[PDB]
Amino acid sequence: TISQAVPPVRDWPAVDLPGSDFDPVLTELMREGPVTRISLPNGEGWAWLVTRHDDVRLVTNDPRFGREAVMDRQVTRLAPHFKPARGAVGFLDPPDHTRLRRSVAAAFTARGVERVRERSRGMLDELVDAMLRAGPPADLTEAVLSPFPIAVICELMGVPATDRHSMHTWTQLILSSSHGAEVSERAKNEMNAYFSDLIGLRSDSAGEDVTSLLGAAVGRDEITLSEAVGLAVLLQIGGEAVTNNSGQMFHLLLSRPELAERLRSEPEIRPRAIDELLRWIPHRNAVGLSRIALEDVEIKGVRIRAGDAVYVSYLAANRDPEVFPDPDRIDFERSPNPHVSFGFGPHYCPGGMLARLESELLVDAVLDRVPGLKLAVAPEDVPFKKGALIRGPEALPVTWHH
């Protein structure tokens, strides 16, 4: 009856934000309305953006939106390079996405990840033992936050003991180090070859570890060898997300002492506190991967045309004032806490339960075993990743009583 003008296209340039400060451009978009249009540094054109919790759930869970179609054109994006392997789990839709996620689902459920809690707790104590032995001045990221997620994933994946040192090295080299491309690509190839072999050997394995599950799914013609290897690599190197995120957790726990004090005073609230931290921490820069409207869809009186690219902001959704009253307040007691830090819909993060487990063990060890733990520099002096997709510290210098 009455025309509702489409929103203006908002430019969203890459900006390095300090520590855990919220993106002011995202804030502006959140205040403009539930549905906006954005233009990112890379790719071409514009894309719709939804920021409200309900809209984010709709776009990420509804069959009317697809991921596969995304690789048909250069959708405006943040990352400089795009158009990777299609077999990538992120670019697959139900006709094949389900087969891949189903293959390893059991190992990533709450009970699945509990299988490695004891071993992981032990490995963490070894890392902390070493840091304490070395003495007071340390980079918590290098000494703990970085190696721990890798050690835990090796155990969950079922990587032979004598091959884990290689996994560590490959992971570090992969998409994050010197001799860009060359070294990174080389390590990526070695890891691919490794998992290609391990999984193949597990063709008829009944093991519960991830590679065994992958090998069996392959053996049963549920997924191809290529599909299994690709996912295995992604899962193997996905721990960096925990390294970065937990990095923000401790930066927060140390810069806002009241938070650390509460967790030491009431250990029982740690699980819920971790979830609150996960909801609050601005995990990434801008937005990640869009979805293409497969047919026309209306959102808050806005007509999203079939073919249009649509982005969701999980960070904004986690600050939805209706769902999270006083959204900017870090409240460990926040009763209902339906955050989407681990995404939503078919593509929700498989590592979510694992990330919570790793975060819980980390908080325990760091807050209970480091006497007088505090930042060794001013909070604003902690270096954070620049030109990154996933936010977090480059290092987290801490000190304590020897």
| Residues contributing to the site for ligand HEM (CB under 6 A) | 60, 89-90, 101, 234-235, 238-239, 241-242, 245, 278, 283, 289, 314, 341-343, 347-351, 354-355
- Number of other CB atoms surrounding residue 205 within 10 Å: 18
Instruction: Kindly state the tokens that stand for 366.
Output: 């760091």
CB of 245 to ligand HEM, least distance (A): 4
Q: Look at residue 6 and give its three-state secondary structure.
A: coil
Q: What are phi and psi of 217, to 5 degrees?
A: -60, -35
| Ramachandran quadrant class, 181 (left: phi over 0; alpha: psi -120 to 50; beta: rest) | left
Quote the least distance from Cβ 377 to ligand HEM, whole Å: 24
The answer for residues whose C-beta is within 8 angstroms of residue 24's C-beta and 6 or more apart is none
Rank residues 72 and 380 by Cβ distance to ligand HEM and give the closer one: 72
Environment class of 180 (CB within 10 Å of its CB; exposed 0-12, middle 13-18, buried 19+): exposed
Picking from 146, 139, 125, 133, the residue whose alpha carbon sits closest to that of residue 368 is 125
CA nearest 138: which of 390, 379, 370, 339?
370
Least distance (Å) between residue 77 CB and ligand HEM: 13
Q: Report the residue number, 215 or 350, with the smaller CB distance to ligand HEM.
A: 350
* Nearer CB in complex with ligand HEM: 77/347: 347
**At 126, which amino acid appears?**
E
Distance (Å, whole) CA 240 – CA 245 = 8
Nearer to ligand HEM, 192 or 399 (CB): 192
To the question of whether residue 349 is assigned a binding role by annotation, the answer is yes
Name which of 6 and 225 has its Cβ closer to ligand HEM.
225
> From the CB of 240, what's the least distance to ligand HEM, in Å?
8
Closer of 90 and 371 to ligand HEM (Cβ): 90
Q: How far is the CB of 326 from ligand HEM (least distance, A)?
A: 22
Gap between the Cα atoms of 23 and 286, Å rounded: 8
CB of 144: closest distance to ligand HEM in angstroms?
16
289 annotated to a ligand binding site: yes
Q: DSSP readout, 109-135?
A: SHHHHGGGHHHHHHHHHHHHHHHHHH-
Binding residues for heme: 349
The binding site for flaviolin comprises 284, 289
Binding positions are 284, 289, 349
